[PDB]
Amino acid sequence: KTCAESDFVCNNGQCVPSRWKCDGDPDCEDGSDESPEQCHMRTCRIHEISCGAHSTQCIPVSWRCDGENDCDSGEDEENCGNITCSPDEFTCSSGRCISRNFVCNGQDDCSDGSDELDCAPPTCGAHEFQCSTSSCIPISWVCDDDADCSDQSDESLEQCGR
Amino acid sequence: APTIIDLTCTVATCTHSSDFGGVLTLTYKTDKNGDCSVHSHSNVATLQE
Amino acid sequence: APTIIDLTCTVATCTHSSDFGGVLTLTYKTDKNGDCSVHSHSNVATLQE
C-alpha cells in the first residue's frame, strides 16, 4: 500500500499523516518523522535507551554498564565493554563476524567450522540433477526431451553435450 | 518416495479392443515431484506404462 | 511499571535444607520489559532475591 500524498513515509516503509512530523511523539518505528537531530529524539521513552539502532529492545539507562548483559547482543556492555556485529554478517562460535556470503560456502572462514554447522546443502540429492532455477529433479530426467525444469535446464544443450 | 494422499481415478473413454484403448485420469495430492511405480492389481486390465 | 498477565508457578525441585534448596519458575506474558519486585506471602518459604 503506497502512502497517500498527505502522509509522510517513514524510513522503514510505514505511512503516517503529515501533521505527525517532528511533533515529539515516537510515531515511526524508526522515528523517521522525528529524526533525533533537529526535530525530536524518537527511538523509545525519554529515560529509556535502546539496545542499538538494530535492536528494538528498550532497556532502562540504569541497565547501561550495570555489570550484566541486559541487551540480547551485549550492546549494553559496550564502551565500558565489548562485542557487536552486523545484520549482514554471521557470528561464529569464536565471536568473529564473517560476511553472510561465506555461510555454508564450503570453506571454514570461521576457523572452527561454525558456518558449516547445520548447513542443508544448497544442492539436492546425489541421485538428482539441479535445475539452474534451483529446482531439484532426479538425474534420470535429464536429456529426456522433456523440459521438466522450469527453465529447460534439464534439457539444456550445455549439460547434455549434444 | 513422495507420499500420495487422496487418490481418485476416472475413465475418459473405454473400448475393449486389441490395442491400448482406454484412457485413465488420476488425481492426487503430494509434497514433492518424483517417480512412482504404477501397477494394476488384476488381469482384467493391463496398463501400458 | 510493566503489566503482568497470566502468571503461572511451577517447581523444578525441592529439598528442605538450611540453605536455599528449591528452584521456582514463573511463566507470564508482558507488554514491555522492566523490573518487578517478587515476594512470598507466607513464612513457610523465604525467597532469596
UniProtKB/Swiss-Prot annotation, chain A:
Q: List the disulfide bonds.
A: 3-15, 10-28, 22-39, 44-58, 51-71, 65-80, 85-97, 92-110, 104-119, 124-136, 131-149, 143-160
What's noted about post-translational modification? Glycosylated.
| Result of changing residue 23 to A | Complete loss of entry of Semliki virus into the cell
List each copy of the LDL-receptor class A domain by range. Answer: 1-41, 42-82, 83-121, 122-162
Query: Mutating residue 48 to A: what's the consequence?
Result: Complete loss of interaction with Semliki virus spike glycoprotein E1
Summary of the tissues where the protein is detected: Abundant in heart and skeletal muscle; also ovary and kidney; not in liver.
Q: Which residues are glycosylated?
A: 82
Q: Where is this region: (Microbial infection) Interaction with Semliki virus spike glycoprotein E1?
A: 48-70
User: Quick one: effect of changing residue 25 to I?
Assistant: Complete loss of entry of Semliki virus into the cell
Complex and partners: Homooligomer. Binds to the extracellular matrix protein Reelin/RELN. Interacts with LRP8. Interacts with LDLRAP1. Interacts with SNX17. Interacts with DAB1. Interacts with PCSK9. Interacts with PAFAH1B3 and PAFAH1B2, the catalytic complex of (PAF-AH (I)) heterotetrameric enzyme; these interactions may modulate the Reelin pathway. Interacts with STX5; this interaction mediates VLDLR translocation from the endoplasmic reticulum to the plasma membrane. Interacts with CLU.
| Protein role | Multifunctional cell surface receptor that binds VLDL and transports it into cells by endocytosis and therefore plays an important role in energy metabolism. Also binds to a wide range of other molecules including Reelin/RELN or apolipoprotein E/APOE-containing ligands as well as clusterin/CLU. In the off-state of the pathway, forms homooligomers or heterooligomers with LRP8. Upon binding to ligands, homooligomers are rearranged to higher order receptor clusters that transmit the extracellular RELN signal to intracellular signaling processes by binding to DAB1. (Microbial infection) Acts as a receptor for Semliki Forest virus.
State the disease linkage annotated in the record: Cerebellar ataxia, impaired intellectual development, and dysequilibrium syndrome 1: An autosomal recessive, congenital, non-progressive cerebellar ataxia associated with disturbed equilibrium, delayed ambulation, intellectual disability, cerebellar hypoplasia and mild cerebral gyral simplification. Additional features include short stature, strabismus, pes planus and, rarely, seizures.
Name of this protein: Very low-density lipoprotein receptor
Q: Which organism is it from?
A: Homo sapiens
Chain's gene name: VLDLR
Please give the range of the full-length protein represented by this chain. 70 to 231 of 873
